[model samples]
Target: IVGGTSASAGDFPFIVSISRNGGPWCGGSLLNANTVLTAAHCVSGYAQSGFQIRAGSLSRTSGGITSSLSSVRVHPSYSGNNNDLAILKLSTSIPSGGNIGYARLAASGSDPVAGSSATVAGWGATSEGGSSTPVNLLKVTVPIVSRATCRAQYGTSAITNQMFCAGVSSGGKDSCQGDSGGPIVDSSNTLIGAVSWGNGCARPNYSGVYASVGALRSFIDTYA
Candidate 1:
């Protein structure tokens, strides 16, 4: 996450660092012992066999229960960045203890109110256009934006009902590159959204957009 502080082990236990072909790819949340929720863009063109999830780790590359994916389920309606959700079934369940657990999905239509604070965590790049990223996880707290306010920033057609926006008006903090598919949780730790897209990392007038979990609940319930 850009302009964020370092996060320690179990700070966000449900978070998992996703890897493709043995390299860092994206971030995900544990839906259950074996199911992972991430962005469709993160796994869209990749084969299931090439992906793996590292659970219970503060670091992205090591010190976790690494498990191969048995299957990947990207949303059927996913187009461009809309409906950007995917479910991955782990070949083996990552044990639920210590720094490993499940993320509670937000209930249908329960999107957070505008101005409410939310937190996003990941192993993504810390700055826009920067090559460096941390070995440990990073986190940033951002305010949720209302539909109208978000739409104003990106325009009507760009801000779909399936998406929501977050970050400050001045834009010093946001989810950046490599942070895609990570969890964005409300104060209660409910899985409200997943990092999707934005104009750039933490740029003013362009809040980071996320795949609204509430708007796409049916898909997850049916598939996860």
Candidate 2:
């Protein structure tokens, strides 16, 4: 996550590294025993042969249960710019424990209001446009933004109901480039969004946009 603090092991058991070209490029969350959820944009155009998920590791390079993707599916509606969600399937289940588990979906009526707390964890950039991403996982706490306010902030059409936004009101807190596909969890720790993009990472008033789990629960259930 961008502009974040280094995270502790197991504090975010569901978070994992989505490796590309033998290195971590994106973050993801466990959905079940053999399935994972990530941003469609994160997996688009990449060969499944080069992909893998690393779980249980606070460090991207070691100390995690790693597995190969049996198959990777980008949403049919994904068009490179929107509907940025994907499901990854493993031929077998990865290991699980207090330090390695899946996250629950948000409740049916759950809709975090603006100012409600949310958190994201990953090993992404430490600052906006910075190359200093840590080997250890990092996490940031941000507040949910109302769809209307979030839309106003962006002043662009890239956001749809299929997505939502979050960030610090005072700015300097957000998910950055290397954090794509990571989970944005609510107060109850239910995963409600997946990191998509933002305007230059943590720019004031420009919260990180996330693919809404609220809008795509059915899609995830049907396939993941």
Candidate 3:
């Protein structure tokens, strides 16, 4: 199901992919004609030249064009627990029009409150280690959970202000493996988080943790 009933790949558009060793792995968002925002872990410690961003289409196999990475800028404070935002500069600007453009950034300092509704979208696997659906997008609505609840379920070491939790403790109806670096958009349809990790895909007592967009606004602005 599409998260929060928002637009599909044809609506918001401008989503991109970050690939490693010629294989697609992570998701990204186009901020402008030249900048794409994604999880830092997708590029941290990796040579910028080794990565490629595919933009302007939903279909990975044939709809979009892959561009060389011109530059990668990870947040200075990014260390897994803290800032997890990153920006990639594409070698060339994506041509405008059609279902291709940038997504609006969440307003600065706006924290999506606990129990608030949100949506997540990605091209990742529907199950752990399962084959991913090429080009097709999957989305689901999840409730923003309290940090205390998240810590209780996933350990204090896993939950932080830099991150937030979502999804049910029970298996199914949640984000599965391979959904990393995808967008978690708030009710306003503004991106409030990015998929990071969980104890496991929809396992009991485990909820999905996402990089907190509110906490990383400054980091995002550095590259926005």
Candidate 4:
């Protein structure tokens, strides 16, 4: 995460690292014992065979319950970065423990209010286009931007109901490359959205866009 602090173990128990070919690729939230919530682009055009989820770990690749994906489903309406969500079925259930738990879903239509703070965590790069990613998890606190304000910056056609914006107006903090599909939780630790897209990583006047979990709660319930 850009301009974020290091996250210690158990700080985000529901967060997991999504890997492919033994490399850190994306981040996900454990919705339940067997279901994971992530961004569509993370699994888009990919078979379910090469994915692996490492849960209950602060490190990206080691010291966690590593599990394989049994199934994957990208949202049908997913176009580019809009409606950008997907769910993965874990081959084995992630047993409950102090360092591992399920993410609580935000209620339908309960997109976080503007000015409220949310926490976005990931193993993504600290800078845009950076090749290296943190082995340990990182997190940032960003304020939610209202739809009207965000649309004014991104244009009307870009900010859809399925998305929301969060970041500082002056820039410097956001989820960047390899952070796709990670959890963005509200103050109460409710899963509000998933890391989706942005004009750039923490650009001035450009907040990071995320897939609204509240707007797609039905789709999640249908499959999760």
- Most accurate candidate by lDDT: 4
- Candidate 4, lDDT over the whole model: 0.92
Better of 1 and 3 by TM-score: 1
Pairs clashing in candidate 1? none
What is the Cα-based TM-score of model 1? 0.97
Using TM-score, rank the candidates from best to worst. 4, 1, 2, 3
lDDT of 2 by residue, 139-160 (tens): 8989888878887887657677
Encode model 1's per-residue lDDT on 106-214: one tens digit a residue: 9998777899999999988888987986789999999998889888888899889899999989988999998999999998888999999999989987999999999
Model 2: clashing residue pairs? 40-85
Tens digits of per-residue lDDT for model 4 on 41-138? 99999877778999999998789798899988989899978989999999988987989999999998777899999999999989878888999999
- Give the winner by TM-score: 3 or 4: 4
Give TM-scores for every candidate, taking all chains together and pairing residue i with residue i. Answer: 0.97, 0.94, 0.89, 0.97
lDDT for predicted candidate 1 compared with the true structure: 0.91
**Weakest ten-residue segment in model 2 by summed lDDT:** 105-114
lDDT of 3 by residue, 149-214 (tens): 889987787677888888765645456554577688887778888878776676656778888877
Whole-model lDDT values for every prediction: 0.91, 0.83, 0.73, 0.92
